[PDB]
Amino acid sequence: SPAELYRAWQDLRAERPQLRARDAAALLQVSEGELVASRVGIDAVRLRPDWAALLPALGELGPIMALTRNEHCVHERKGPYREVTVSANGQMGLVVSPDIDLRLFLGGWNAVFAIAEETTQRSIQVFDQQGVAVHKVFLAEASDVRAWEPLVERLRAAEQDAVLALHEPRAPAAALVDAQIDAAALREGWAALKDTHHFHALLKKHGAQRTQALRLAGGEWAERLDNGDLAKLFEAAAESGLPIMVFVGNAHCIQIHTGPVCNLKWLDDWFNVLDPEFNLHLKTTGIAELWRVRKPSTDGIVTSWEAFDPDGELIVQLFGARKPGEPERDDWRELAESFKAL
């Protein structure tokens, strides 16, 4: 299998070099993680899933680029991989800094590979239990390359294992129809929210999908916007120099940009941010619904825009820049509210 897979990939690549690994893997009926596994003993080394050792260690690489994405949006942020914190039970990770800013949900993180692609482009690539990408970090020119080999050697997995073991995904708990939701209680809970953290518990408490909750919250809490307006918001934020927060993630990893955005560009269906330390690539046609959301909190009402795909998963979220213990800034609040609801 691994040999044929790697060869089937290269043949596909020769005919269609635009195809990236993720794309190639789909065409070859395998996960990206299995595709990467087939590179082991060619240009990849499998590493131990030792998150508590691995994560702090990436700091020795100096300035890198961190890439986190979902199906429709890719978030690339440059900076040193610091400061890393991993929880007691090793299931939760944090990277906190003005540049690399990450929330890591380690329990689903399955395999990790170090890739030295000759082209030599070096990267650490992490895959989940279904072999879907979680998070990647690429070395740049500014990276300290002398750190690479010792890091790799220290983390080398005992078994090269060029196959990788994949689990079946846990069943999606029953989706309730809108009428089966206690809307009033949902609303009461919404108003009582103290930490934007406690929102997830609220959805679970009422068994509501995230978009479903938005639908039932009511307009003072959540209103649907024209899908096109998200790009216009970036453009409007760019013209003002308003410092914002852009959240992009998947089931296992959330990546954050905090600061202004400058250069915005369209390219077919792609809307992009193209700044020196931050690139964002959003496939706008993946956007099924867009919402302005307002959540009470001990720091005050917090306003955000939330974009979702047709399966109801989050694609990207925008907030105003603020430290913890601070209220959101009126400039952001103004802008976020300035667009007319459907």
- Give the residue from 55, 35, 38, 60 showing the smallest Cα distance to 149: 60
Annotated binding residues for heme b, written as ranges, equal 103, 196-197, 210, 295, 322
**CB of 297 within 8 A of CB of 257?**
no
Q: What are the residues whose beta carbons fall under 8 Å from the beta carbon of 161, sequence distance 6 or more? A: 37, 40, 46
Helix (H) or strand (E) holding 192: helix 183-192
> How far is 31 from 303, CA to CA, in rounded Å?
37
Binding residues: 103, 196-197, 210, 295, 322
Token pair 């809490």: residue: 221
CB 190 within 8 A of CB 184: no
270 and 72 Cβ atoms separated by less than 8 Å: no
Edge-to-edge strand ranges of the sheet holding 102-105: 84-86, 92-95, 102-105, 253-259, 244-250, 314-320, 302-308, 289-295, 222-225
All residues at 6 or more sequence positions from 341 whose CB lies less than 8 Å from its CB, including other chains: 219, 223, 224, 225, 292
